[PDB]
Amino acid sequence: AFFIPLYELFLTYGGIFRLTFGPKSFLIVSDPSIAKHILKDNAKAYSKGILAEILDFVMGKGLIPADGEIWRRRRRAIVPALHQKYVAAMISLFGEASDRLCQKLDAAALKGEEVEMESLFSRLTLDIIGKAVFNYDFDSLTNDTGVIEAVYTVLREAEDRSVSPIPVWSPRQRKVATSLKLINDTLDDLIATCKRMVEEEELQFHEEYMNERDPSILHFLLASGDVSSKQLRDDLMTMLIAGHETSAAVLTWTFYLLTTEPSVVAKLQEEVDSVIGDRFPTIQDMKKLKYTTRVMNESLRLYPQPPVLIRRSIDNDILGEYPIKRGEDIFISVWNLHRSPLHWDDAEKFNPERWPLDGPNPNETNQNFSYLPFGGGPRKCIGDMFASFENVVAIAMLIRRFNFQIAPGAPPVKMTTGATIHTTEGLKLTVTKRTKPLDIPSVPI
Numbered sequence: 001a002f003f004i005p006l007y008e009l010f011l012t013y014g015g016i017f018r019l020t021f022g023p024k025s026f027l028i029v030s031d032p033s034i035a036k037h038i039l040k041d042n043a044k045a046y047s048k049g050i051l052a053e054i055l056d057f058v059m060g061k062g063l064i065p066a067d068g069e070i071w072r073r074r075r076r077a078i079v080p081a082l083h084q085k086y087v088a089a090m091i092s093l094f095g096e097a098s099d100r101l102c103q104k105l106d107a108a109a110l111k112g113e114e115v116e117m118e119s120l121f122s123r124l125t126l127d128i129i130g131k132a133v134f135n136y137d138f139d140s141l142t143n144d145t146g147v148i149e150a151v152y153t154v155l156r157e158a159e160d161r162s163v164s165p166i167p168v169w170s171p172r173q174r175k176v177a178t179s180l181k182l183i184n185d186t187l188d189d190l191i192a193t194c195k196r197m198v199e200e201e202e203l204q205f206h207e208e209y210m211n212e213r214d215p216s217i218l219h220f221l222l223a224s225g226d227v228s229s230k231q232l233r234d235d236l237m238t239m240l241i242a243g244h245e246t247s248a249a250v251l252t253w254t255f256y257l258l259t260t261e262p263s264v265v266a267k268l269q270e271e272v273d274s275v276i277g278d279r280f281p282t283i284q285d286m287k288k289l290k291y292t293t294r295v296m297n298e299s300l301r302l303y304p305q306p307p308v309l310i311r312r313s314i315d316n317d318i319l320g321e322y323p324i325k326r327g328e329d330i331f332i333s334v335w336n337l338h339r340s341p342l343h344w345d346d347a348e349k350f351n352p353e354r355w356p357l358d359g360p361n362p363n364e365t366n367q368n369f370s371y372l373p374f375g376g377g378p379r380k381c382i383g384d385m386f387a388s389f390e391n392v393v394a395i396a397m398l399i400r401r402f403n404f405q406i407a408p409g410a411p412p413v414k415m416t417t418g419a420t421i422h423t424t425e426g427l428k429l430t431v432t433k434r435t436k437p438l439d440i441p442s443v444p445i
């Protein structure tokens with residue numbers, strides 16, 4: 001909840017102030033022009049600062065905590081893997097995995113059982129990202145394994161390291177090392193298997209390269225003639241963490257928000273029934289699911305993942321009107337930017353159509369850095385199309401099949417400090433079926 005007090009301090013003291021706690025301090029930036037200066041116009045004057053001390057233990061030299069030449073080299077190598085053909089193929093994976101979740105919800109609906117949606121969404125996004133990135137099937141939606149428990153142990157340690165530098169106003173360290181070893185060994189097995197597959201395949205590599213039997217990013221990188229084993233594992237681990245935690249929270253907060261506005265749910269149900277019905281969405285459906293897209297856009301506005309971006313000055317600069325030297329630890333409050341009453345009409349209202357339904361999708365450019373769901377400038381998210389489609393698919397397929405409501409007596413929904421916005425106790429919902437089992441599958445065109 002660290003960003004919550006920063007909001008009211010922003011209202012009183014403005015778009016840049018120094019939050020001091022004893023002999024240390026952070027600069028808190030909530031001004032879109034200043035954010036644009038740091039993230040895009042003058043990014044060369046900034047490092048990821050504290051972000052690296054948080055994530056280094058698991059991401060190593062991966063893209064998110066990296067800076068300098070190793071960042072530039074790996075960025076140029078990895079971005080080509082997320083080409084249009086790859087993203088189009090991942091939409092099939094999104095639908096298959098979302099359908100496996102629907103089967104779980106359908107079983108609960110038939111028994112009248114309530115469901116805790118945050119944990120289910122975490123399993124869904126873990127299953128998707130493991131397959132998309134390095135061709136592994138966690139199947140966390142169905143089972144628990146030592147590999148799955150290792151990932152969540154590592155995730156929890158990353159959460160602990162995120163809260164550690166933040167002011168408030170062994171045996172675990174051995175379990176972490178064991179979990180890291182199991183995941184690294186697991187990745188090593190996949191890398192070895194994939195190299196064998198690359199050596200035996202007959203496919204000329206091109207800019208749209210994709211082996212249809214193994215379309216993972218790991219396979220693209222290996223067939224491209226890419227670096228060391230440590231570096232490749234770090235690259236994969238970074239994308240695993242990034243693509244799991246973010247969308248798990250986006251889906252959680254999207255369905256929380258849906259319970260707050262029945263008229264939005266009605267309009268969403270109308271679109272999904274009309275556009276996809278019971279179908280697995282395709283790439284063509286991504287442009288037609290316009291209201292679903294806006295619901296996702298508005299969820300990311302109200303609950304950004306992460307709610308803050310972290311930088312450190314490595315040179316002199318000017319922020320707003322204020323000169324700074326190198327060494328300033330800076331938190332850009334995406335939360336404040338997204339909820340600023342100066343730049344948003346009825347900023348606290350869940351209103352998917354605050355951007356025209358038939359107009360351009362909102363991004364950091366056309367919102368002039370008052371909206372930054374995927375960051376901006378050279379360090380902008382590389383999975384932004386991937387994740388946007390992933391969440392549209394999950395939302396649409398679930399809303400097609402079920403009605404969701406806050407469960408009676410459910411624990412309150414409150415936020416926590418972390419890399420992403422988790423709830424305190426989950427999102428406990430009742431789930432009822434919208435369609436009949438004996439109805440013929442409906443395929444609209």
Ligand code: HEM
Pocket residue numbers: 063064075238239242243244246247250305306309310372373374375376378379380381382383384386387388
């Ligand atoms: C809703 C889902 C997601 C959200 C909200 C999100 C958000 C972000 C943000 C805000 C940044 C910029 C961080 C900074 O500037 O310090 C970022 C970077 C990054 N994200 Fe995403 N992300 C999502 C999903 C994904 C996925 C699915 C992948 C990979 C398949 C991914 C991989 C990355 C990588 C590698 C970077 C580092 C880029 C660089 O520094 O060159 N993310 N993400």
Ligand SMILES: CC1=C(/C=C/C(C)=C/C=C/C(C)=C/C=O)C(C)(C)CCC1
Pocket residue numbers: 001002003051054055064162163166241242243245246305306308417418419420
């Ligand atoms: C950059 C990045 C990530 C890490 C964020 C972290 C580590 C945030 C720390 C936030 C703090 C300290 C908030 C305090 O209120 C993710 C979510 C892994 C993936 C998407 C982009």
